[PDB]
Design a protein around this ligand. Sequence first.
Ligand SMILES: CCCCCCCCO[C@@H]1OC(CO)[C@@H](O)[C@H](O)[C@H]1O
Ligand SMILES: CCCCCCCCO[C@@H]1OC(CO)[C@@H](O)[C@H](O)[C@H]1O
Ligand SMILES: CCCCCCCCO[C@@H]1OC(CO)[C@@H](O)[C@H](O)[C@H]1O
Ligand SMILES: CCCCCCCCO[C@@H]1O[C@H](CO)[C@@H](O)[C@H](O)[C@H]1O
Ligand SMILES: CCCCCCCCO[C@@H]1O[C@H](CO)[C@@H](O)[C@H](O)[C@H]1O
Ligand SMILES: CCCCCCCCO[C@@H]1O[C@H](CO)[C@@H](O)[C@H](O)[C@H]1O
Ligand SMILES: CCCCCCCCO[C@@H]1O[C@H](CO)[C@@H](O)[C@H](O)[C@H]1O
Ligand SMILES: CCCCCCCCO[C@@H]1O[C@H](CO)[C@@H](O)[C@H](O)[C@H]1O
Ligand SMILES: CCCCCCCCO[C@@H]1O[C@H](CO)[C@@H](O)[C@H](O)[C@H]1O
Ligand SMILES: CCCCCCCCO[C@@H]1O[C@H](CO)[C@@H](O)[C@H](O)[C@H]1O
Ligand SMILES: CCCCCCCCO[C@@H]1O[C@H](CO)[C@@H](O)[C@H](O)[C@H]1O
Ligand SMILES: CCCCCCCCO[C@@H]1O[C@H](CO)[C@@H](O)[C@H](O)[C@H]1O
Lengths: 304, 304, 304
Amino acid sequence: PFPLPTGYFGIPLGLAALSLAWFHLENLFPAARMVSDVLGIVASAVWILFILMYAYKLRYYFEEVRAEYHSPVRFSFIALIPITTMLVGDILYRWNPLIAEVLIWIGTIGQLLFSTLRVSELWQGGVFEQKSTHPSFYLPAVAANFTSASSLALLGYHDLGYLFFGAGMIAWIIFEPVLLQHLRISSLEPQFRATMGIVLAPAFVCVSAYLSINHGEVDTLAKILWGYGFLQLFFLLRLFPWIVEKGLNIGLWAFSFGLASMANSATAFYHGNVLQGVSIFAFVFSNVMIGLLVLMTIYKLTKG
Amino acid sequence: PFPLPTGYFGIPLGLAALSLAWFHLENLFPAARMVSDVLGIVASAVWILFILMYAYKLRYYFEEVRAEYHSPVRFSFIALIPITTMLVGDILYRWNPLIAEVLIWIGTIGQLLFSTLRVSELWQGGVFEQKSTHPSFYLPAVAANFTSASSLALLGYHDLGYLFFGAGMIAWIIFEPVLLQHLRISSLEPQFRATMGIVLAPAFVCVSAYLSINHGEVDTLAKILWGYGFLQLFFLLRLFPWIVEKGLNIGLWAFSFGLASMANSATAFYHGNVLQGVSIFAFVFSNVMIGLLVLMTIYKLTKG
Amino acid sequence: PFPLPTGYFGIPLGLAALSLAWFHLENLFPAARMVSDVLGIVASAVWILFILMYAYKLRYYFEEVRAEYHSPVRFSFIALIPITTMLVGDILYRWNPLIAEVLIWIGTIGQLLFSTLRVSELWQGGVFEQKSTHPSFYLPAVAANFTSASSLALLGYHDLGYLFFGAGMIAWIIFEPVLLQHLRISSLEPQFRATMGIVLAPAFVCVSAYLSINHGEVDTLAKILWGYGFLQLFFLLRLFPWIVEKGLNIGLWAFSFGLASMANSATAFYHGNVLQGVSIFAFVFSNVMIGLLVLMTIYKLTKG
Ligand SMILES: CCCCCCCCO[C@@H]1OC(CO)[C@@H](O)[C@H](O)[C@H]1O
Ligand SMILES: CCCCCCCCO[C@@H]1OC(CO)[C@@H](O)[C@H](O)[C@H]1O
Ligand SMILES: CCCCCCCCO[C@@H]1OC(CO)[C@@H](O)[C@H](O)[C@H]1O
Ligand SMILES: CCCCCCCCO[C@@H]1O[C@H](CO)[C@@H](O)[C@H](O)[C@H]1O
Ligand SMILES: CCCCCCCCO[C@@H]1O[C@H](CO)[C@@H](O)[C@H](O)[C@H]1O
Ligand SMILES: CCCCCCCCO[C@@H]1O[C@H](CO)[C@@H](O)[C@H](O)[C@H]1O
Ligand SMILES: CCCCCCCCO[C@@H]1O[C@H](CO)[C@@H](O)[C@H](O)[C@H]1O
Ligand SMILES: CCCCCCCCO[C@@H]1O[C@H](CO)[C@@H](O)[C@H](O)[C@H]1O
Ligand SMILES: CCCCCCCCO[C@@H]1O[C@H](CO)[C@@H](O)[C@H](O)[C@H]1O
Ligand SMILES: CCCCCCCCO[C@@H]1O[C@H](CO)[C@@H](O)[C@H](O)[C@H]1O
Ligand SMILES: CCCCCCCCO[C@@H]1O[C@H](CO)[C@@H](O)[C@H](O)[C@H]1O
Ligand SMILES: CCCCCCCCO[C@@H]1O[C@H](CO)[C@@H](O)[C@H](O)[C@H]1O
């Protein structure tokens, strides 16, 4: 018996997002569907297990959940739950649209309630401190809204999806300035550094959601978002030795959301015949990196 | 004899903006014109009175005006004067375009001169402090430019209106990051908390101005802005008990600008057959809230 | 023998940018080509000389270069080198596209390597301080990417140009919030104040690059960018007496990038029949100001 660390939801999140990326290649390359289905089944299975473990945590370790919830830093990871729930919904849609729709709405209402209760509460002051300014804040504030946007578009609710999209995009632009200034001034401690991987996510998750809503039209906004996304990738690549100064660890799954969304967006750029060479590199790169994450995770698992 | 607190201009501002919202419903529902005209006449009458009271303040309480002007916090409320002057111009345009145009230009030149003198002066440093980072800054920096944008569009100056629009939109995105970080860290004191209502304004005033310039075309930008606007609404609703911790007060008119612009934008979304259900809710909600403000103000007035 | 202060690259930068502005008037007014060619030849000659002087610095004053590189403030000026190299490439393209393309790629790879190594390294914390938050940061972070964007578009690489464009535009919006808050709180010391001129650059360099990529189409984004650009101009004009409190100096070339890009963008607005009166004013204003910079520089040179 142990309380499931909430961050572990990043594993099915990354796998689910990568399933969706491969799904979007099926009409260019049919074998991509089998790869998508396998990734989707594994992500869903891991999600079920982690959901049940989290239900156990709520039942028997409620004070740990309460403390994470009220923490001005640790609360953000709870947003992984409804995010992964929506992504699993998006996977399941290929097989059962009714069950998919239920999960998508549960995740959407859940993330919106979550932010509305906790993200706003921060504006009361005195609890959040300068040192609370962490990449994890992107999860409730930004990533959850993008995930809702694309999931609702999948269901046919394009205009409602644009509202969530806007909420996420503007929230992103409003938070990042203060995050990067904080990182410049204050050296994130090693135990939090893997969460630098979340810094990769905004531009790529943003363009993926946008392309999901706008029928895959690769337009000026999409190209703009990709450009900033690759800038951040190059920066994070340069920073990687510092990120893992104290060793490789499981927290590196933090990168998987950005990586998977880079792959997903790459499929749309390829479909649209925009920067196809860059698209192929992006898609291959993201898959290799997530493959390495899977292989390091199997290892850790075969070492208890 | 007393010096008129400059913040009181928020009352005719909210009423004038709400008049304009109803005005935009007239071709869907004719009776909306009577409601618009009544609101517009009351707003204009209150504006005349407050202008005369402010002329008296300048004549006999000039040092109080000087101190408010030089304050790195209190200067912002002076921007209410040219903002309300433009909105009254926009109302009067339905009856007398020549007088309307004069007021619109006086307000536009006045707000631009005001910002150019005072907002820039802050960049000299040493006067503005971290604790000066208040929602009121939106008034000179953001709301005034949006108001110019839409007023100039009304007069047929669409391209000039886009310049003001851009100034306001980029200024908004450049200020809000630091405002929300400050609110997270430092608990705004109760006496300033009603000004949290100004946080509702940017997205809604922005989309209202945009739709005024672009002939009511509800496009991707407009939907994006509405999404962030509703996020902030939900946050402020959650925060409302904290906002009024020390009691309901007249400062709550601070919400009326955002509310009225939510109503105005809702008329355009409805006209464009986008999210009509949300539009009706938004329009009804905003009217009820401003109706409550009017009823609390009549009360206060019937209690001296 | 002396080590060339890296900031001096701002002189050929401003002249090169102004050459390109005049170049864009040639099909409206043929005599503009002669003016462009003369400015372009002078900028290129000054650039060659400064490059050779900088090669000498690297060879015989390497520790001075190393210290500037590692400084969390002074590193930014090194970005002037690849920026000016690209602009000289853009000039030379009218005579020799092959040599132009080589310079453009050297400058593009060089600026991207430079940022990737140094701008990201800041996020390790503990070196950059709040007082490091200076306008010069725009050079590597923002201006270099815009310059790449427009130079690559010149070569026909529009989509790749949009990636650089996005990187610069989003980087701009993400840095400026914290810069203006810092300037409000902390009074930039006189010796750095001329660099306030760099604050003029982002919106104008941004719209110039955008118009270069999008075939000169003056659209809503372009008008938006111009509006914020003129707001900042008016602010900087008001601030000018404070900027030069301790006297006029050669650092005022800092303004030339924004001024030249105001002129360049003005040619496109004029071509597109948008705000032609404003365009003429902008173009004339920018030329007069840069003419004054040239005349003060000849003076200083005729006084050793
Ligand atoms: C992922 C879905 C998350 C839903 C979270 C439910 C939280 C309800 O719990 C609430 O937390 C608060 C907000 O800070 C409080 O102030 C409450 O009164 C408390 O009931
Ligand atoms: C709403 C219209 C407002 C116009 C305000 C006029 C202010 C003119 O007053 C000016 O204020 C300054 C700027 O900080 C000064 O430095 C001046 O010299 C002073 O004359
Ligand atoms: C304008 C083109 C600039 C290229 C700059 C080359 C810099 C290479 O120098 C590098 O600087 C670093 C990054 O901070 C280091 O950590 C290195 O190991 C060092 O080799
Ligand atoms: C995954 C969703 C996490 C929900 C975290 C719940 C936050 C609990 O919030 C708590 O709820 C209480 C009693 O149940 C109140 O007594 C509290 O004081 C409050 O701390
Ligand atoms: C950070 C946000 C960047 C927003 C970029 C928006 C770019 C709008 O790009 C659009 O391109 C289309 C091509 O015909 C046309 O609609 C217009 O040229 C333009 O509005
Ligand atoms: C998002 C990236 C997924 C795209 C992977 C495409 C790999 C195929 O590669 C491409 O195949 C072609 C036709 O099918 C060719 O004409 C090519 O030149 C070749 O590069
Ligand atoms: C509504 C517009 C408010 C204008 C506020 C005016 C700010 C006054 O600015 C003052 O003007 C002076 C004398 O008149 C100078 O002597 C000052 O030192 C300066 O404080
Ligand atoms: C924070 C700013 C968000 C800017 C969003 C701009 C969205 C541009 O949306 C536009 O949609 C039109 C539909 O055909 C086309 O012009 C293009 O797809 C696109 O440029
Ligand atoms: C901005 C919100 C103002 C719109 C208010 C519209 C209220 C009318 O309500 C609508 O009337 C119709 C036709 O007129 C119908 O067909 C509807 O189903 C009904 O909802
Ligand atoms: C114009 C490009 C400027 C390059 C600045 C080079 C930064 C040098 O970086 C230095 O390089 C070294 C040795 O050569 C290492 O020994 C160092 O410790 C490192 O400081
Ligand atoms: C800070 C960023 C501002 C982005 C502004 C984007 C404006 C998009 O403007 C575009 O105008 C065109 C006119 O038909 C159409 O494509 C749409 O109306 C709209 O998408
Ligand atoms: C970017 C600004 C450069 C444009 C400079 C244009 C100066 C010419 O000026 C214009 O010339 C015309 C025809 O050529 C006229 O019809 C005009 O009314 C006149 O203003």
